[PDB]
Ligand binder design. Structure first.
Ligand SMILES: *[C@@H]1O[C@H](CO)[C@@H](O[C@@H]2O[C@H](CO)[C@@H](O)[C@H](O)[C@H]2NC(C)=O)[C@H](O)[C@H]1NC(C)=O
Ligand SMILES: *[C@@H]1O[C@H](CO)[C@@H](O)[C@H](O)[C@H]1NC(C)=O
Ligand SMILES: *[C@@H]1O[C@H](CO)[C@@H](O)[C@H](O)[C@H]1NC(C)=O
Ligand SMILES: *[C@@H]1O[C@H](CO)[C@@H](O)[C@H](O)[C@H]1NC(C)=O
Ligand SMILES: *[C@@H]1O[C@H](CO)[C@@H](O)[C@H](O)[C@H]1NC(C)=O
Ligand SMILES: *[C@@H]1O[C@H](CO)[C@@H](O)[C@H](O)[C@H]1NC(C)=O
Ligand SMILES: *[C@@H]1O[C@H](CO)[C@@H](O)[C@H](O)[C@H]1NC(C)=O
Ligand SMILES: [Cl-]
Length: 527
């Protein structure tokens, strides 16, 4: 019988057979009181104790959220839809332990993405069993509330202060601190890693004083708080919570009466009004996300970064080659998952209007002219590849390098990667390239399972990424092996070297998309 005694009770888990060995899994440990009724929109309250045995034998409920129904039956979009029931009773976490039981194992804590509106830790691409099995690390993942039930903000008001989902993550990091030693983990060697909004969450934990002692190192994939989509000013966050009160019929004179009104609304009526809090409408919009709440985030994040008020430790940061293409099928004219998506100059600027609704006509012309110095003046794909890299550079690559520059300037070693391999099983068309989110299955080692049609090059590369990630967690350096491996050098503001990841060849490059990023850093803020 598999049983472990936490500080709030005792949990029992399962034995899983992985690659001829076994990994012990505990699925769905509650880490907070279910934020129901009076506790909706509040910070997570601590659990007390159970005096029984909690069968942590199945993934728990996912937090209430809207579902991506744009392409019914399509694996490419539904692999991100939650695969458990939805409920506000959703603050649970998962723990993967290598067998035989370790003694001081390093812990990887995964924070999922999904624009702070969607996501769950029970997805197949977040399965921590191979990381536990292949690198002998403990993997932890939690669910945190998303949408308005996680980030509705009346700044200063404890009934709905903002950033509740971030506090959900933080209290799960407190659970790891308090209980992971009972599983064989080292509380003093914990590495947070995540993707997109999860990577942005990780970067925010680097700023929040309440998280300073709850982890050791950080890995950020396709995300950081300085991204345009990552943070809403507290002034704008308050307008949208009152707009959503208007859509619900909850507009009152006192703030606490407004919150009392939305606490008795059915969860499905809150989700159904979330998309309207803003006129529109980027497929990248975050209607309810992190804000300056004066508690988890005491000031605008770019200020505390510039002022050096963040945790000083090693970070690992990187992006994919075609971050932008995933978002053009969600509204840009002429783009389709079933077409080759060749678009015209006109469709390109109308695509710009979709992603840049509040930018002047001069500003849209400058973007266009910076991305139309064709190499083959008469290549059709020119305009559709250009707009993908506009979305990609602006929303991910340039903010990620700007974060790593400014972070590295305070004396800690930073490592930057560029993920260039497209999955051989990727269900999206070839024109979409190496998409946002499709490095995750290589980070979690899914290509190491030789029975899901992956190529041998892909298992080699995934096994390398798994090792570099685990070694950076253990040692603060993503060294793969001492010999017969490409050394991964530190990102510095001077040379800005980064390591590229693909099956063909891992080489060392410099100044990634420097000419494109110079436009978004030093010209675009002036239009
Ligand atoms: C480079 O990675 C290697 C592993 O590939 C680390 O080497 C050591 O690994 C053994 C286990 O085989 C441990 O007993 C040692 O303690 C490890 N070394 C250290 C310094 O702890 C090594 O840590 C990495 N080296 C650097 C400089 O990052
Ligand atoms: C895993 O399964 C059960 C746990 O209840 C136990 O009998 C068994 O010894 C465990 N380990 C292995 C290697 O099967
Ligand atoms: C699951 O837990 C219940 C009580 O919550 C217990 O009665 C049952 O035996 C457990 N399942 C097992 C041990 O397989
Ligand atoms: C785990 O490692 C830490 C330092 O990383 C050490 O202080 C602690 O005593 C270790 N715990 C063990 C070996 O049980
Ligand atoms: C607040 O929201 C409404 C949406 O109905 C909008 O008309 C108004 O301009 C907003 N005020 C802001 C964003 O300052
Ligand atoms: C395919 O491309 C055309 C070209 O404009 C576009 O209008 C259409 O929406 C795309 N998708 C389908 C299913 O036709
Ligand atoms: C690819 O298909 C399945 C993957 O689920 C696997 O069982 C099979 O052996 C692989 N190879 C071939 C030739 O089908
Ligand atoms: Cl400091």
């Amino acid at each position: 019988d598999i049983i472990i005694a936490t500080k709030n009770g005792k949990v029992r888990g399962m034995n899983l057979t992985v690659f001829g060995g076994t990994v012990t899994a505990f699925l769905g440990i509650p880490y907070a009181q279910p934020p129901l009724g009076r506790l909706r929109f509040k910070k997570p309250q601590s659990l007390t104790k159970w005096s029984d045995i909690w069968n942590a034998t199945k993934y728990a409920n996912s937090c209430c959220q809207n579902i991506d129904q744009s392409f019914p039956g399509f694996h490419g979009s539904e692999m991100w839809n939650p695969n458990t029931d939805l409920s506000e009773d959703c603050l649970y976490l998962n723990v993967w332990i290598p067998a035989p039981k370790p003694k001081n194992a390093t812990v990887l804590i995964w924070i999922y993405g999904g624009g702070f509106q969607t996501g769950t830790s029970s997805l197949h691409v977040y399965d921590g069993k191979f990381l536990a099995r292949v690198e002998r690390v403990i993997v932890v993942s939690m669910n945190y509330r998303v949408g308005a039930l996680g980030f509705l903000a009346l700044p200063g008001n404890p009934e709905a202060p903002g950033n509740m989902g971030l506090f959900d993550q933080q209290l799960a990091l407190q659970w790891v601190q308090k209980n992971i030693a009972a599983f064989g983990g080292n509380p003093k060697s914990v590495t947070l890693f995540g993707e997109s909004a999860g990577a942005a969450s990780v970067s925010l934990h680097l700023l929040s004083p309440g998280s300073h002692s709850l982890f050791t190192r950080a890995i950020l994939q396709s995300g950081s708080f300085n991204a345009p989509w990552a943070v809403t000013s507290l002034y704008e966050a308050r307008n949208r919570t009152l707009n959503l009160a208007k859509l619900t019929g909850c507009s009152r004179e006192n703030e606490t009466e407004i919150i009392k009104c939305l606490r008795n609304k059915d969860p499905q009526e809150i989700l159904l009004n979330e998309a309207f809090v803003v006129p529109y409408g980027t497929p990248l919009s975050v209607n309810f996300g992190p804000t300056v709440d004066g508690d988890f985030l005491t000031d605008m994040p770019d200020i505390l970064l510039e002022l050096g008020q963040f945790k000083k430790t090693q970070i690992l940061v990187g992006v994919n080659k075609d971050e932008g293409t995933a978002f053009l099928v969600y509204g840009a004219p002429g783009f389709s998952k079933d077409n080759n998506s060749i678009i015209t100059r006109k469709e390109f600027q109308e695509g710009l209007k979709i992603f840049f609704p509040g930018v002047s006509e001069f500003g849209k012309e400058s973007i266009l002219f910076h991305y139309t110095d064709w190499v083959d003046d008469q290549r059709p794909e020119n305009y559709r590849e250009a707009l993908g890299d506009v979305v990609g550079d602006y929303n991910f690559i340039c903010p990620a390098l700007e974060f790593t520059k400014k972070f590295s300037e305070w004396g800690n070693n930073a490592f930057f990667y560029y993920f260039e391999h497209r999955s051989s099983k990727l269900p999206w068309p070839e024109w979409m390239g190496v998409m946002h989110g499709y490095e995750i299955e290589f980070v979690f080692g899914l290509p190491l399972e030789r029975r899901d049609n992956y190529t041998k090059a892909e298992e080699i590369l995934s096994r390398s990424i798994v090792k570099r990630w685990a070694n950076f967690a253990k040692y603060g350096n993503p060294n793969e092996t001492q010999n017969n491996s490409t050394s991964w050098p530190v990102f510095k503001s001077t040379e800005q070297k980064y390591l590229t990841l693909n099956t063909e060849s891992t080489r060392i490059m410099t100044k990634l998309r420097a000419q494109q990023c110079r436009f978004w850093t030093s010209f675009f803020p002036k239009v």
